[PDB]
Amino acid sequence: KTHVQLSLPVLQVRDVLVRGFGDSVEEVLSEARQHLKDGTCGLVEVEKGVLPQLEQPYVFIKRSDAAPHGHVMVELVAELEGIQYGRSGETLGVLVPHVGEIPVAYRKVLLRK
């Protein structure tokens, strides 16, 4: 399938134990895609002071369309030193590895895979 319905656990930034996917734009996008497929991917909602608590490069999920079965359509955009790799809509949050942190909510997304 070109798209996969996912429910992403929403994590508080101060709970997150692994604060990024790796060390290059290509690696973080790769790792994010693998974790999204394996159901081992969390979402941190971006507010004032969140991103400097996480590791660059960042992986964002961004709205790709204006929501089948409640799932918002999204795609991945990476960022390193203020340059983004991809072009998409509004940020729903930043992706991080999920290693058993207790979520505060779930974000239903339809991922262009």
UniProtKB/Swiss-Prot annotation:
It is found in: Host cytoplasm. Residues 1-113 are annotated as: Disordered. Signal peptide: none annotated. It comes from the Viruses. Residues 2-113 form the CoV Nsp1 globular domain. Inhibits host translation by associating with the open head conformation of the 40S subunit. The C-terminus binds to and obstructs ribosomal mRNA entry tunnel. Thereby inhibits antiviral response triggered by innate immunity or interferons. The nsp1-40S ribosome complex further induces an endonucleolytic cleavage near the 5'UTR of host mRNAs, targeting them for degradation. This inhibits the integrated stress response (ISR) in the infected cell by preventing EIF2S1/eIF2-alpha phosphorylation upstream of stress granule formation and depletes host G3BP1. This is Host translation inhibitor nsp1. The gene is rep. The chain holds residues 11 to 125 of 7096 of the full protein.
